[PDB]
């Protein structure tokens, strides 16, 4: 299947409290493998995956220098946007950047990622053509005009098609054994008499990796989608995830309903019913 390498940059200002907090978090697919944090005991690039320990000191020195270099650039950009918008210096503002590339099985570049965000609103973003920009507001037009006369779009396309892909290939082969590792969801169905003259069946799914999972309730071979209370997948804290589906069924009809657990770590989708001990 397809894969991607994305870097999540955070830049939050703190007026009268010191220099802005700077963060760089890399993601091979959905897995965090590197992290840099200015507000830490020691501001250096730290591995987040045990398969990144293979890289030598030469690698962790380059990325650190690049991180500090980036932090200074964003420290300026935080002040620069105060001028574009004509805002006050007393307020704390946030810059967020998502940057990376998605490469398919064929090795072909599928997506070029480069989007900026100021205070949660979209600011500027590299289009699919990898040559033009989409400015989300009046102030971004200033940035856009600067990047046109500087040819930033062309310099950026080079990184996306070249550098970013080369490193994705390297990261993938350096940790493919662990990236493929999957934990099977351990499922069970609980029972509660919460509604009046009715009950509630809650199908659980615990200790699974990755977060990709599908839980459905069925009756007469048909899925209950609107009648299904589904909660967001959450972390258990140990590296795995949890999720459950609730459905309100009439009393005495518990056995007529079945839960289904779909996951890539399962040889066969799980089928569960309510069962009293």
């Amino acid at each position: 299947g397809p894969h991607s390498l994305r870097y999540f940059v955070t830049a939050v200002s703190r007026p009268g409290l010191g220099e802005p907090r700077y963060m760089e978090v890399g993601y091979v697919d959905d897995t965090e493998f590197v992290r840099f944090d200015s507000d830490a005991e020691n501001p250096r690039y730290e591995p987040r995956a045990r398969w990144m320990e293979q890289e030598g000191p030469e690698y962790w020195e380059r990325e650190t220098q690049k991180a500090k270099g980036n932090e200074q650039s964003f420290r300026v950009d935080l002040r620069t946007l105060l001028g574009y918008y004509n805002q006050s210096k007393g307020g704390s503002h946030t810059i967020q950047v998502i940057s990376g590339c998605e490469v398919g099985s064929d090795g072909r570049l599928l997506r070029g990622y480069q989007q900026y965000a100021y205070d949660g609103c979209d600011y500027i973003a590299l289009n699919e053509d990898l040559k033009t920009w989409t400015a989300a507001d009046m102030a971004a037009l200033i940035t856009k005009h600067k990047w046109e006369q500087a040819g930033e779009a062309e310099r950026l396309r080079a990184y996306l098609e070249g550098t970013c892909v080369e490193w994705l290939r390297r990261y993938l082969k350096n940790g493919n054994a662990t990236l493929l590792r999957t934990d099977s969801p351990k499922a069970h169905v609980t029972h509660h008499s919460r509604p009046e003259d009715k009950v509630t069946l809650r199908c659980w799914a615990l200790g699974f990796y990755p977060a990709d999972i599908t839980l459905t309730w069925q009756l007469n071979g048909e899925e209950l989608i609107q009648d299904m209370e589904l909660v967001e997948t959450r972390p258990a804290g140990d590296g795995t995830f949890q999720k459950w589906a609730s459905v309100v069924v009439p009393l005495g009809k518990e056995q007529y309903y079945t839960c289904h657990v779909y996951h890539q770590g399962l040889p066969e989708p799980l089928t569960l019913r309510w069962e009293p001990p």
């Binding site: 990325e63 946007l81 500087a150 550098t163």
Partner: peptide, 8 residues
């Protein structure tokens, strides 16, 4: 390897 960002 992340990219060397350009100023706004």
């Amino acid at each position: 390897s992340i990219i060397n960002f350009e100023k706004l």
